[PDB]
Structure formats: structure tokens, C-alpha cells
Amino acid sequence: KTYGQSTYSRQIKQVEDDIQQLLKKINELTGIKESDTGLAPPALWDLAADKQTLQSEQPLQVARCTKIINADSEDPKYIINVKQFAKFVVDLSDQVAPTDIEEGMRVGVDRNKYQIHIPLPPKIDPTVTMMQVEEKPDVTYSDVGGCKEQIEKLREVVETPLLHPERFVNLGIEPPKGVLLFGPPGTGKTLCARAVANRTDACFIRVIGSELVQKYVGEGARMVRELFEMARTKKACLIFFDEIDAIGGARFDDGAGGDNEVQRTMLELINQLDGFDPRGNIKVLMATNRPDTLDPALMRPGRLDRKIEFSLPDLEGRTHIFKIHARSMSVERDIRFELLARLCPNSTGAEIRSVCTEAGMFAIRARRKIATEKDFLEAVNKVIKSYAKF
Amino acid sequence: GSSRLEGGSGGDSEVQRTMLELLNQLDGFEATKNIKVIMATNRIDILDSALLRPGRIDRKIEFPPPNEEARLDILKIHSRKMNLTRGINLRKIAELMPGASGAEVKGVCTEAGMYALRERRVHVTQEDFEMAVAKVMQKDSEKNMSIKKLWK
Amino acid sequence: KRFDSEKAGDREVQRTMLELLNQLDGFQPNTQVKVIAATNRVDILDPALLRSGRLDRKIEFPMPNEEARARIMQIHSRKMNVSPDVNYEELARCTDDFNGAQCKAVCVEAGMIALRRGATELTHEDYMEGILEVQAKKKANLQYYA
Amino acid sequence: IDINDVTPNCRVALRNDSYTLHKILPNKVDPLVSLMMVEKVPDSTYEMIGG
Amino acid sequence: ASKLPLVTPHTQCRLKLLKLERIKDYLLMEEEFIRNQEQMKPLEEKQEEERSKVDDLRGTPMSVGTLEEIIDDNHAIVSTSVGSEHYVSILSFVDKDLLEPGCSVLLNHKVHAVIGVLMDDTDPLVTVMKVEKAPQETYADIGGLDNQIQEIKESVELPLTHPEYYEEMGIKPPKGVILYGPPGTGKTLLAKAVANQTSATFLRVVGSELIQKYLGDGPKLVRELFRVAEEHAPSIVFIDEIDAIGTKRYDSNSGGEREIQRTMLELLNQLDGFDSRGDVKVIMATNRIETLDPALIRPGRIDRKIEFPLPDEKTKKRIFQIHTSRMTLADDVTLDDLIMAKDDLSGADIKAICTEAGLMALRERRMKVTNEDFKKSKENVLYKKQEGTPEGL
Amino acid sequence: ELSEEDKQLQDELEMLVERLGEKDTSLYRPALEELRRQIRSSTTSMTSVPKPLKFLRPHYGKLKEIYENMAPGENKRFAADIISVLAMTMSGERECLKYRLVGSQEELASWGHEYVRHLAGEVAKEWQELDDAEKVQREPLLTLVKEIVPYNMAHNAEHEACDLLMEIEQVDMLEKDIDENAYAKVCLYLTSCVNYVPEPENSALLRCALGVFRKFSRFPEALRLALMLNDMELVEDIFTSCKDVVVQKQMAFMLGRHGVFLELSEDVEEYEDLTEIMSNVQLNSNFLALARELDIMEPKVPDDIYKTHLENNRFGGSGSQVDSARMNLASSFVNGFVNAAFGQDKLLTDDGNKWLYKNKDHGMLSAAASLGMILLWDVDGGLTQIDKYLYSSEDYIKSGALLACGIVNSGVRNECDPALALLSDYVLHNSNTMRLGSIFGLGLAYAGSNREDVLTLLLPVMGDSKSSMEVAGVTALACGMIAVGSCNGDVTSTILQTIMEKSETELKDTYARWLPLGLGLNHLGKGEAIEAILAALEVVSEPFRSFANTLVDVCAYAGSGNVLKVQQLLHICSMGAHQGVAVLGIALIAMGEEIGAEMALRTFGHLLRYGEPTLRRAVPLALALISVSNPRLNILDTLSKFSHDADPEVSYNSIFAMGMVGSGTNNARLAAMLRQLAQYHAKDPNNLFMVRLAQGLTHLGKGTLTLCPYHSDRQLMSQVAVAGLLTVLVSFLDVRNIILGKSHYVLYGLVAAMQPRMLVTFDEELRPLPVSVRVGQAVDVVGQAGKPKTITGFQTHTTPVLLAHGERAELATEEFLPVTPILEGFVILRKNPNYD
């Protein structure tokens, strides 16, 4: 047997095995054999055997997707383009009001008279619709230690104007609509981005620069346009371009074409950010390690108004980071996190988190259930000193 | 071959599916099976590196351009199945054809056959072979100098 | 610019450019549709596109001078409650090598600084702080200069 | 028709109104591999490939 | 099977025994009830004829479409083979957990309602990338690493084998490992050994395979490599020869250098970015670590950095024994004489020595390898040194 | 083997089997000390069995022999200690504990946790096996346990310490060394273990937790535990002992929420205000303040909920002719539910007589009561509006006004006793309809009060001759609600006498089902104390006897999670009509622990799959009770399946259960499903009535009210709320005759369970104080190291938030320190002195 993990370990194992066996017996007795045709469990062939599939196939007809092109006269007369089928001049159904249908939107049409029955959401690239955050991270501003002024500026750029709009309209201020985050690796740029995503009560669209690079000519620009249209659809929506240096390289066209397609994608991004048309209620973050490579047009105010600089934390910030990262750890009662912060010279929150994890693993190695100050010291020696060449 | 993730196809291209199945069969069949495989290539570099892995076809043999004796033997091999007249000195033909390769030696035989055809006899002659070499080697030199001019 | 290169992709945009050239000026002259074009770079534009029958009036837009900077700051401070102390001439002198966007940034940053401080109306100090913020100047950790 | 005869990659005939497999039509195997055996490969030897 | 989430302390405890005893009691109740009711009445006929009604509802000639978008109200836009798209109703007998954009759905012939979903091929890139059991060997072959093996196990194996140790302390396991050392020390060997000894989908990619010839394909390849790594439960992604794609990242470069940099940036984001990485472990090997990017090997990206040194005195003997295990030798082999020289010999060099000695014995027709054969093979192997003598010394 | 120098040096002692035996003293102390150091030395791997132990394993018999009976000074002690540690691997008898009892007395921390845990398990096993007769032998075990416990507490094994003390049953020892840091974790673990343990130990665990909380002066937590324990003397003691008036106000809020009133002595400080908070006099004012803050004041007419124009009007002309009176009744119920507690309504307020006379027969009674439902919690304003209808030419309208007054007073307590003052006149009136209205109004107004005057007023009605079975059952229900959780001898004797007095033919009536329900409500929550009632009832006719037996048993074991009782009920299910009550009681019992709730969901699914119509007509009503106000997608799908069902009773019960599950949630998906169901049952009057009721329930209040009995982190149970839910559901058991009939006023029992979802935070002087909070799904953090987060998927709002089921709230900033840790309901917040 083993060395003994717990007095109840054998009982837990036995009960788990019995639970698995009972589950197997119940499954065998009730049937529920897997189906290769994608059939739900018989207990959920529910209203499907009958009584709603019947009453859904009887009254609910089949509509066909089409795209309106023109509306003729005040009297309803709509030109539609059924994909790969045909084009028709069609009328509305009694259920749909004329105001619901506009030019360019997708409308379902019946198969007999081809009249519009229901408007449909706009067609959007899967690769741009998957940029939306949907589920937001659990990080908060309290988990970012050592950055007070930076976070204050970031909030007043992205958070406060959305939360308390009247405060700025009253004083006649148009708050900055873009911010750039730059600094040494591991300083907390993406962490602050996650905090902003969590706190925001609005659309958060996450875009990675490398995604906009595409094989075919004129694809990054199309993706950028679709992304900004989807953003405009919303009442207010934040876009975060991580690693923007991938596509924001400075214009250097000369002789043989070099990165011309990426430059075109950048130009489309610039045009969307600031151009003839008015940008919606869209606030834009950008995080990068090499702000130098960015182009003057993109770094101009009106596209990136604020430039927040992230630097290695001070002693107090290092102490706060140590506390934050040791919060959810099994540690002794009194550990001099101030001593640890001093003992680690200029270093990043990533280094501090690595130190905490390595202290925990030294404990796990020595077969202890409580990380000690000695463990933390050994972790500092291993991370800050031994790997000092990196 | 070339590579398994080459054009971004993710290995789904037919050219790479064929390589995958060839490698699968090669790994499946055992060494002590008296089924050996000999693969040849004029372009070793572009060859896929997954075939030269240990546990597969790893041994490799090189082939310089044929020397005089090799050229004569290849000429004999490719002229075996042709009606040749008495006293045909393929050795003198090989000498009159210096610095020729397998393709040239193969083509000279067909050209000699065609010249015999034009003369309308069922046998190839030494003069026919001489004219055939004079034609094929000269056209090869013409192609070489054309390539040189294009480079210029 | 059109160049003889073996790289594809550029040839498609070149074909679109040729169509645009023909539409601007060519067979079937057009006299009812005007054109306005804006470019950050004119050294890369094709000669056939910078011709005198297609883009006749090439207007240069220089970086603003002191008076231009003062006017821009006034224009963008029209709507804000600004005290009658701000020396827009001093701000123009101190904002050398700026553009209109940077001057707008100066004004909006002055407003935001006032908001941070909790002030109803802006001030010359707020404007100078905004100028410093927009300049995006970093310190070298020491100032050994006299 | 027994399913065991409905093998992968085999031509079949489906009825008109409702597609219902009702025959297993002949298939062209097209064996392209039984045409490159050279037996013992006579008259191909080291002596005559000298060099 | 959608069983209760215990979420008791999650460590062996009396509360976790009580919550678990309760589940067992309820399951026993259900089992007894179902058994007794089945004995009283089979209900097999009732279970049947519901399938008959379902088959009636979904006609005989079911067509295969392609789901495009779910309106989230038991309605969908489905594209037929020709290319047309229809706005139909997702019926109640279709397992909606399988529906996702791009899936192959089964459509009714007349009404085109979604009445099922078909399974799809299993090779996006999995068959190409996965290594299966490593053909080389298990941990037995590796000789003289020991501490490096322990570090790798603590990185990749232990989290899957005993996760309670980590869950107790509340620390998450170290993110990734990078194996660095001079050429021929055993980085790929250890990676293959852990791959064959582990229970997680192991994926291997050589950095030279990420230098694609078309714009954006390197980034797409890394994106898809990490895409089919969360789809396969626990997984280990081993990017061998990272030095090809990762580099100091000097801005002043032209050509494919920019594309390589973009690929590296995408890999950086995948390793640590906005989104949580799920349960995937990354291993990397590099003969040349000094030229890598600090952003690429920063702590949060790669936690552990293992050094692989050249075998010194006894690891050499161990590799020699391991590689000569399946090889008959004459009783005059001075393996100690072979290893005694301080010739910076590598394990790959030892393997080549053994293979060449066997090959030349075979050439000479002998039935056993000799000490002179080993010595001549070693001399031939060490003949591949090159360089200049006086230069640098 | 490679490093077998360890083997060689281990032999240096192993072969010297008597190295300590040899007379030379150089090998006595140093040798054993070196062996102890080696075995205690740790390793670099977490694999198994440290190398020294794996090496000394075989040398067990000789290790024993070298101990035997040599000199007792130090040699025997050290030998015993090494034997003990080695005894871990052999895993036979209790040799580790034996030798620790007789061996070296060192500190276990020097030996490590993997050994302390083994020794603790052995101590527990020996204590359990050992009989009480051997007291003097327990003392060494007691001192060993004393040594173990603080070690676990200091090394962050609070769960282990609690487990050991619970196994040896000496749980009272914790309070003496709990310390102020591990008290939170220990109390949480004990309170979590309380649920899954039998009766003789659950109370002990709760009392130990309360002791720790009182020791550290966590008065709100202590009062929560006292309320759970149902120890009113403890509740009074805690409340009076608390010497901080603000904390006493917070506890007064908790007591008022739970429906518990303490008769405070007039001399107590701030007595009138502490008694005003408990009486919920300000509840209506706070509710209206929240409504104004959230901007939901505008009344909503039933048409807004119905949204007929969205549906495809295929039959907009000569459509199906539904019962217009029934649909008007549905509209009245929907209006009442939607506008509940707000005070304004666009139908009855503007011109109420027209809307009332639009209905027919009893529909007038229900519509009139809807006015009180709307004016809920507004006793002051209830009368000035209900007076117009209190004097009407229609007995139905007057009875409805009586019930409306009762409803208005329900949930709040005044010193004027308006409900009694108004409804004591018509209790014995000769009109049975007015009797019904007055009885139900009084019951709803004084539910959970245990008022002797009201009870003695009501009780004679049951025995009165000129009282229909309906009035008798309604009086039993009212008495049960008034005396819920009281075991009133008067009520139980009266109900038993009434049941015995009636004949078999009279008991065949369904209205008679309300008497056993009354007894069960009276005895609710008192398990093992209903044997007397069962014995008394054993002399009634077989069918009704079985029904009453099952109902009383399930009501008595309500909210206990008794697996044995659930097993008995499943046997009953697998005959008569008591099977439905058995199915309902399964949920009634499992309504607590989430584990039990979900396993019961599985069991109910199997019950619907294999079952008879009687059982199937009751499963849907069990689902609603198990998950009321918790719109779970799986449960909603299950209910939607059986909404379109052949059995009309199953369809009706499924629709109403869907409404109950969605009660007070405004769930968009549920609203869409209900509109689809209205379209489906466009031409079925009863089903359409049920659909309209379900829509009204779904939009109960305006998202500001809940019917969930539980509160305070889903740990405390509301007797009045459970009583109302049981009333409505047991009535539904025969929906055709009661609800779709002449007695649908029973639906107003839900007013008992109606409570707000708000989270309003006040200052120290009972004044609104907006504060930023994070609202997200709760996360269980038991037995997790450190201070892990307590919420997931959270967002930030300002103080007056509406909390959905399973939503915890946590203050965003450290500016304010809450008096109570459970951020829910009304919470007083204090400034934090060390904010910056």
C-alpha cells in the first residue's frame, strides 16, 4: 500500500468505486445507448417524439435566407438576393412592419411567394465573432500591485467616461478614447487589460495582432472593418489590441514591396480609429513591448491619446505583489514579505509569482504542508539568482 | 514529400496524405521481412527529412556522373534492344560522345534509330550513331549556352 | 509606385490603381464628379497618379506655426470653462514641434487634469501639465546637466 | 440487400422518390499495381553494368 | 455522468465522505426503484415506438447540410450542399450539445429542419502532430540525467499523477519547461521518454516547421496547434528547436524575419495572454538559449529552465552500456579506455561510435565486435571536429 | 542500489543487531541518535516511503528485540519511538500508538505530518474500540489528542483537527484553543458538517460552533446558529447580551426577516426602535425607496406581460372561444402578481368596480383579494383603499376585501392588530363564503405568530355545525399557518377530533385533505415527535388514513434530508392517492442540501419515466418545491416536456410548476417558453389559464420578490414560506376541483413566502448609504488553504441591488466594514477606521 494519505482515503476510494459501479448499472438498466445520428437521450426526445415537433413542423414553415439590396418607392417593394438561388422583387408579410427592414440586412423569405417574414442578424466572420469576450476574467484591480498612477490613468481613459458620462459633459470635456500600455515584459499590461475587461459594463473585444495577418490580399482590412462594425452595433464597446507591434510596424515602403499588406491593414485600422466617419462609443486599448516600432499615424493623438509607461515595481509595490500572490497559499503566520521584496532586486510581478510557486514546490518536495520563510528564501535564490542570466 | 506542414494545409494536402500512408506502411512492416525499399532522387535537398529517420530508409548511396566505362556500359544497355549492323563500335561512339549523361545516352539511341528510319533500313549504322551523337550533344551544348546567356 | 518585381499581390493593387487613373482622367472625360485625396506620403505615389490632369492642385499641409497652434488651442477650448489667464501665446511658444492633434490632446488633458484636481475652471498650470503629459518625455533617472 | 455488402467506396443505385438503396452496381477497381513486376529482371547484372 | 459536484474540501475529509455517502444512498435508491419497476413492467415497448415516431418525423432521405449560425431560440441558419441557406427549426430530439458552427447536420428533406448531427473526422492536425508511444524507449535508456528527469517529472508528470499536493498548497503547477544544453545531450530523448510514459496527448513540432512560405501561415499553424491541444484533454506541446522561430527580435530586419517575429508573437500570446490557457503543458528545447527572446522565456511564460550538461565520467559509461546492450561483444572491450579521454564526447557521439563499430564489424564479416574496431570507430567519429587549431588558443 | 552506500551504512546498524546491547557505551546513544536522524531526514521526492524507512523495513523483529525490556531510562524510550515510526509501514496492529504511549516523549512536529496523521487515526480507532469502563487508560489518549490538535491548527489542518475531535466525540475541546485566526475556518467546517450528520450530533456541532462564535464576539453569526438550532432562549440571551446597539439593530433585522419576534423588556436601550425593526414596519418604505431608485414604479397591465401582438395572429378573427370569465380571473391574478407590493395598479385603482364586476362568481373574490396582494406590506394604506369594497352588495366582494386586508397585514406586525379587529366579526358569520375569506385572511395575517387569542378565536370554527368541509379545511390550514413549528396541543387536539368526527363518505372529499396538512404544518420540522400523531391517526379509514399518515410524516421531516425517510417514500411510490403526497414529500425533505436536491431531481426524472398517472401528476409539483425561484435550465426543459402532455392534469401542474420555478426572475427564456405555450394552448381554457398564472408568477413583483423559503446563504429556513408553498402545492394535488374550480383563493398562500430580493445597505442611523458591491455566483471555499475568493462571474453595481438565487455579494472597497458577514437583505455598514 501507500504511506498513508488520510485516515478516510480508503473509504473515499471505496465509495467512489461503488458510485461508478452503480452509475454503470443504472445506465445499463435504462439503456441510453449512444447514437451515431446525434440523437439526444430518450428522456430528452422530449416533445420530439411528438407534441412539439409535430406542432413546430405544422405551423412553422421554412424560410430562406436572403439579403435585401434596394427598397423601391414609399410603397413596399424590395429587391432581394437569395444566395445561390435567384434575385426577386418581393413584398412584405403582414407580420413584419416596414420600419424593421432596411437596406443591406438579411431577411428570411417563404418558398412560395418569396415575401419577407423575419429580419435576421448580420453575417459576421467566425474569426471576428470569436474575439468577443463573452465570459470575463475574474481578475480585479486589487490583484495588480505596484501600479497606482498607471491604473488611475487607465481607468479615467476607459472606465470613468463610461461609468459617469455626465461628469464630463457637464464640464464640456471630451475624454481620451485610446491608451497605449508599454514597458518591460512581465510588468502587468495584460493583467490590467484583464482587470479592465472584468470591471467594464460594456462590450470587450480582444484582438491579437497576429490574427489580423492573413494569407490573401485585403483580408486584414476586411477583418478590421467587420470588427469595428460589430463594435458600433453595441452601445459602447472596448477593443484591446494585444501585441499591436505585429501589424503596427512603421511605414518603410522602398524598392521591392515589404510588408505592404500588413501596412494596408494598419492603414485601415488608422482610418477606422480616426477618419471621415465618426467613431462610435469605442474605447481602444493597446499593449506592446516595443512602442518605437509603431507608426507616427497610429501613435498620434486621436488614435492613442494616452501613453502609460509600465516599469519595475518599487519596494512597496513588490511587498504588495508578494502579498497578493501569497494570498491563496498555505504559508506560515509571519513571513517578512518586506524582507523578501528587498532580497529580490529590481524584478517583475512574473518573477514574484514564480518565486511564490517555487517556494510552494520546495515545500511539496520536502513533504510539508506549509511553506516556510526558509522555503521562500530558497525560492528567491533559485529564481532571482540562479536564473539571473535570463 | 518536401515537408508535412508546408503550405499551411495542416497535412491535409493529398501530396502529404500519400507521404503519411507511405510512412505508416514503412513503419508497419518489419525489418526481418525480406521486403526492401530503394528510393531514388536527383534532388536530395528537397527530399522530405521524415524518410531518412532511423528506423526507416536512412542509408544513402551517391552517384557521380558516369565515367568512360560507365558511359559505354549504359550505351550498350540502352542499345541492346535495337537492330544494329555488323561491326558497330559503340566504344568509338562513346569516345566520340565525351562528358555525356544517362539522358544523352538514351536519346542518342532513339535518334540513331530515327536516322536509320529516314534512310529506310531495318538496321542502325555506325554513321547513323555518329550523326545522332553530333545532333544530341550539340543540342545539349546549345541548351547549356542558352542558359549561360540567360544568366548573363 | 509601380515596380518590376516578382512578388504577386502588389500587381492586383496596381491594376486597381490603373482603373482609378482611367476613371480620373482618360477616355470619356468626366465633368460632374470631383475628387479629393489625402496622403501622408507623396514620395511613393506613382507619377501617373500625381499627373496634372488627375491631381492638379497638390496642397501642402505644414506643421502649424506659433499662431496656428494658438488658434487650434483656442478652437478646441471654445466649449470648456477656461479662466481669463491662460496665455495661449506662451502655450504656442512652449509647444514647439506639435500638430493639431497634439494641441487638441493638450486641451483635453488640461481639462482632465482640472477634473482630477476637482476644479470648475481650467488654468495655465493645468495647461502646462497637459503639455507635459502630451509631450511623452521620459526621465533618465538623473539630471547631471547644469 | 445485406449491409455487409455495402462496403465503403462502392457505387449504389438509389430510387427516385425516396433515396433507398436497392442495388450494388459494378465498380471499376482499376488495379494499377499489377503492371510493374519485372520478375527476376533477367539480363540486368553487375558484369554488364560494369563500372 | 453529470453527477453532483462534490466541492467539499476536495481533500480526503469526513465532509467529503458524508457528501459521497449521500450520493451513494440516492443512487442505490434509484437503482432499486428502476429494477423493481422494470420487473413489474418491462416498458421496452414504450421505449420503442417513440423511436418509431422519431423516425417518422425525420424522413427517410435525410440530407447532410452544414450549420452556419444558431439564433439561440431553437432556430438556426443551415447551408445546404448547393450553397443555399435556410432558416429552420432545431427539433427536440437532436443533442444540442453537439451543435457548433461548421458542424455537419442532418436536415429534413422537405422541411429542412435540423434532425441530427453527424460525427466528423478526427485529424485537424492530430494525426500529423501526435507522436503516440515514443518508439525510442522508456526511462530506462536515459542514463546520468537523474536530476533533470526529476525536474521534468515535477513539471509535467506530477501534476497529472498527484494533483492533491498542488491543490493543498493552493499553488498552480509551474507553467512550462525549457531544456537547454550543447548539441547532443538528451533533450529530445527526455521529451520522448516523458511522452511515452505520460497519459496525456503529446504533440511535437519542430520550429523549422513553423517557417511557412505564405503570409500568416506560421501564426495560423501555432494557433491551430494550441487549438487542438485543449480539444484533447490534458496535453503536452513540445516545440523542439525553438531557436528557429524565437530570436533576439531585432527590429531592424527585412524579409521573412518579420513573419518569424509575428509567429513568435502569436506563440507568446498563446503561452500567456488575455485568455486562460486551460490544461496544457509546454516543453521547449534549444541548443542555443542565449539568442532567445526575454519575452519568450520570461518567468510567467516558462517557469522552469533545465540545463543539460555533457556527460563527464560515469554517465559516459552508462550510455555506452545502454547502447551496447543489444550487441554481442568480444571479451576484450576496454570501455573504460574508450571513455577515459576528456574529449567532450556527447551521447549522440557515443551512439554513433557504437553503430559505426557494429557496421564495420559487419563489413569485415566478423561475429563479434573488437576493441580495435571500437577504437577505430571512435577515431573516425572524432575526425569530425574541423575548426582551426591556433585560432582561439 | 546505485547509491547502496546507504544500504551499507544501514547495515552498519542492522548486522550489529545488538549494537546498543554491547556493553560499550559508545554505541548506546550515538548509534540510536544517528538512526533516528537518518529516518527523520527528508527526501527530494514525494513518491513513497522515504529511503531510510524502506531500508529499515525488514529489520522489524530485531528492532523490537533490541527494545524488549532493556534499561528504561533512555534506551527503551528511544527504541520505542523508532519502533513506533517504523510501525507505519507494516500496517498491522496499533503498534505505533502502543509505543508512542510507552516511548520517548518528544514533539510530534519533529516527526512530521505523515506520522501525526497515522497516529491520530490510530488514536481515534483505539478510542472508539475502547469501552468507557477503562477511564484511566483514556488519559494518555486525551493528552495525545491535546498535543495533536494545536499542531494541526498551526499547520493549517483545521479540518483534520475537527475530524479527529468529532470522531472521538470530544468536540467541546476546540473552544479552549481555537485561536482568533482559525475560528472562521473551523466554524465554517463544523456548520457545513452539521447538515450531513444524525440528530444526536448535529445539535452538538452547532452548539460548539456557537460557542466559538460567542467567544470571539461574532454576535450575528451566533444568532444565525441559534436560529438554526431553534433555541429561542439562546436567541434571547444573545440578543440581550450584545451591548452594541448597532449590532442589536442588525440582529433585529435578521430576526424580522426570519419571522421571529422577541418580546423585549421596556427597559432595554433603543427598545422601541429595535422593536420597530423586528416588526418590519419600515419594510414597505424601504421597498418603495428601492423601486424609485431602480425606476420600476410604472404599473404594468397584464397585456404588457401577455404580449399577444408578437405571436403570429393566425386566428385574429373568429378564433377559439375561450371562457371569458376564466380569462378575466387569470388577468386579475396576473395583475396582482405583477404589481405585488408596489401599491399602484392601472386596473383596480383607476376604476376597480368595473374590473371586479367583469369577473364572475368567485372570480370576484379572487380579484378583490388581488387588491390586498397589490397593497402588500402597507397596512396603513391598505384600509383606506379596501374600505370602498369592504361594504359591497356582493358577499363575494366583501369576502375578497376581508382576504385583502389579511394579505395586506401578512408579513408585518402592528400593535393595532388590524387583521384581528376587522376579521374577528365574520369568523362565525352564516355565509360560508365570508367565513372562508375571513379565516384565510386571519391565517395569512398571523402566519408564524402563534397568537393564542387568534387561535382560540379560530378553533371553534372547525367543530361548528354550519361549516362546510371547505370551511373546515381552510380553518385547519389557517391554524396550521398560525401555529407553524409550535406543536400546539390545542390545535392538534382540535384537528384530531375533527378528523375522527367525520364519516368515510365525508372524508372521500378532497377538501378534507387540508386537515392533515394543517397538522403537518403545525408539526413542521419536528422529526421523531410525530409518533404520537401517527398513533392517534391510526384509527381512521384506510385511504384517508394513508394519505394523512404520509402527509404528516413528510411535513414533520421537512427540511431534514433524511435518506431513510426518502427511501420509505420511494417504497410507497413503487394503490391510492397518497403517492402524490409521497412524491411531494421527497422534495420537501430534500429541499435542503444541494446534493440531495439534485439527486432528487434524478429520482423525479426516473419517476416520470416509470410511473402511474397519479405519481406523474405530482412529480411536476415536486420539482417546483425543490427549485422555487431558481430557474435551472434542466428543470425548465423537464417541465416544458410535460407542458405538452396527453394527461391534462400533468399539463396543468407542469405549467404552474414552470411558473413557480421562474417566480420573481423575469427570465427571458422562460417568458418566451410561456408565450409559445400560450400559442400552443390557444384553444384550451384550463391550460391557457395555467399559462397566464405562470406568466404572472414569472413576473412576480417586477423582479423584486422571491418565494424561496431559504435565506441567509441558503442555510436558514422560513417556516411561514414553507407553509404557504405546501398549502398551494397540496391544493394543486387535485388541481381540477380546487384551482380550476370554486376554490382558487388558495393561491394567495404564496403571500407567506413572498419576500424581497433586495440588498439595501444603511448607515449606522438607519439611512440609505449607496456602496459598491460585487455580485456573483457563490463559491464554496471549505478546507482550502489561504483566503480564496468567495465569488465568481461577478460584476459591480451600487448598493440597492437585486440578488438572484445563488448570488453572493461582497463589498468592492474596504471603506466600509459590514456588521454582518452575510451581505443580504438589509445590512448596516460602518466606516473602517484604518481605511488608508
Ligand SMILES: Nc1ncnc2c1ncn2[C@@H]1O[C@H](COP(=O)(O)OP(=O)(O)OP(=O)(O)O)[C@@H](O)[C@H]1O
Ligand atoms: N503589478 C503586478 N501585480 C501582480 N502581478 C503582476 C504584476 N505585474 C505582473 N504580474 C504578473 O505577471 C504575469 C504576466 O502577465 P503580465 O500582464 O504581467 O504580462 P505583460 O507585461 O503583458 O507581458 P508581455 O510583455 O510578454 O506581453 C501576470 O500573470 C501577473 O501574474
Ligand SMILES: Nc1ncnc2c1ncn2[C@@H]1O[C@H](COP(=O)(O)OP(=O)(O)OP(=O)(O)O)[C@@H](O)[C@H]1O
Ligand atoms: N544520456 C543519454 N543516454 C542515452 N542516449 C543518449 C544520451 N544523450 C544522448 N543520447 C543519444 O543521443 C541521440 C540524439 O538525440 P538526443 O535526444 O540525445 O538529442 P538532443 O540532446 O535533443 O540534441 P539536439 O540539441 O541536437 O536536438 C539520442 O538518440 C540518444 O540515443
Ligand SMILES: [Mg+2]
Ligand atoms: Mg500581454
Ligand SMILES: [Mg+2]
Ligand atoms: Mg533535439
